[PDB]
């Protein structure tokens, strides 16, 4: 009779050496209770074909297969991998090294398991897009520093 098990998913933005976005997908799956902090969630990370991530041997190039554990009261215990090699493979500088962060151990600040329904919240990162100055609009101000508006 159609067995099935709990899951949660998300996507998140990243920038290149070139000014361009790339979302990557994340898939959480609870595959076991375990002792104290029973929760164990294997974690999958993906990117669209041309880009690559993992070194070798798992080993489709796109996919990372980490894991995550939450402590007895829903505070996070640990999560792995903490970092990601990422080469866009589109002329952008290769081997960018992202370091994903999901909160300090034993704290509510990051991921938190709970009896309540799972939902994403928050998302933030470094990064811009290339810009250029527009000469027609300049404006000097008081105290004499010269503003510019890209």
């Amino acid at each position: 009779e159609q067995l099935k098990l709990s899951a949660f998913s998300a996507g998140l933005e990243i920038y290149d050496s070139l000014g361009s976005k790339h979302t990557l997908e994340v898939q959480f799956v609870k595959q076991s209770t375990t002792q104290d902090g029973g929760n164990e969630w294997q974690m999958i990370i993906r990117v669209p074909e041309p880009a690559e991530i993992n070194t070798t041997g798992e080993g489709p190039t796109n996919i990372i297969v980490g894991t995550a554990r939450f402590n007895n009261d829903g505070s996070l215990a640990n999560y792995t991998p903490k970092t990601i090699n990422f080469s866009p493979n589109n002329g952008a500088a290769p081997n960018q090294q992202i370091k994903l962060s999901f909160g300090t151990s034993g704290s509510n600040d990051g991921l938190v398991s709970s009896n309540s329904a799972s939902t994403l919240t928050g998302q933030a990162t470094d990064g811009y897009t290339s810009g250029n100055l527009k000469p027609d609009a300049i404006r000097v101000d008081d105290k004499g520093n010269i503003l510019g508006e890209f």
């Binding site: 159609q2 067995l3 099935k4 098990l5 709990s6 899951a7 949660f8 998140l12 933005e13 990243i14 920038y15 290149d16 799956v29 609870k30 595959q31 076991s32 209770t33 375990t34 029973g38 798992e58 489709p60 796109n62 996919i63 939450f70 960018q96 090294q97 992202i98 370091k99 994903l100 962060s101 999901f102 990051g110 991921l111 938190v112 398991s113 709970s114 009896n115 309540s116 329904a117 799972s118 939902t119 994403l120 919240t121 928050g122 998302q123 933030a124 990162t125 470094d126 990064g127 811009y128 897009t129 290339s130 810009g131 250029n132 100055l133 000469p135 300049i138 000097v140 510019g148 890209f150």
Partner: protein, 150 residues
């Protein structure tokens, strides 16, 4: 202050008809380049303490894009018994026991590692041959079976 040179011979004025040229230098009427100091892009900061140079605001300023280096998330995850359509189908088990019949290499299951993939009936790559605690199982309604003990 103004100077015809690198600033070796300053001249003082109270007039202020400052204006940009086709080139970046920031010039008054007839020639002289006003003294002051330029920003450092590595720090995005002005450095007032040192001796003034000629101002130089190249009209085609260009900001290189900043690579994202970090990613953050905060999210609840329902460890509880009542998921609702936040599920996933249970993993397939072709193996007789620790043996894919597709690839005939002997990789034993339950390792909680060496996760292994297959192309699906569509084309997406997905997980196969992974045993599960059975204490995590949910029915079609997403209610926990809540199996325990003996």
């Amino acid at each position: 202050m103004v100077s015809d040179d690198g600033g070796l011979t300053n001249y003082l004025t109270r007039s202020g008809d400052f204006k940009l040229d086709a080139y970046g230098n920031f010039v008054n009427n007839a020639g002289f380049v006003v003294q002051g100091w330029n920003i450092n892009w590595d720090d995005q900061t002005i450095d007032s303490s040192r001796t003034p140079q000629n101002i130089f605001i190249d009209p085609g300023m260009h900001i290189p894009a900043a690579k994202s280096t970090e990613v953050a998330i905060k999210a609840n995850l329902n460890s509880g018994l009542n998921i609702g359509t936040s599920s996933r189908n249970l993993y397939a088990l072709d193996s007789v026991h620790g043996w894919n019949t597709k690839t005939q290499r002997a990789e034993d299951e339950n390792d909680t590692g060496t996760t292994q993939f297959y192309t699906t009936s569509k084309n997406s790559v997905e997980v196969t041959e992974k045993g599960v605690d059975a204490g995590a199982l949910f029915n079609a309604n997403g209610t926990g079976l809540n199996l325990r003990d003996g």
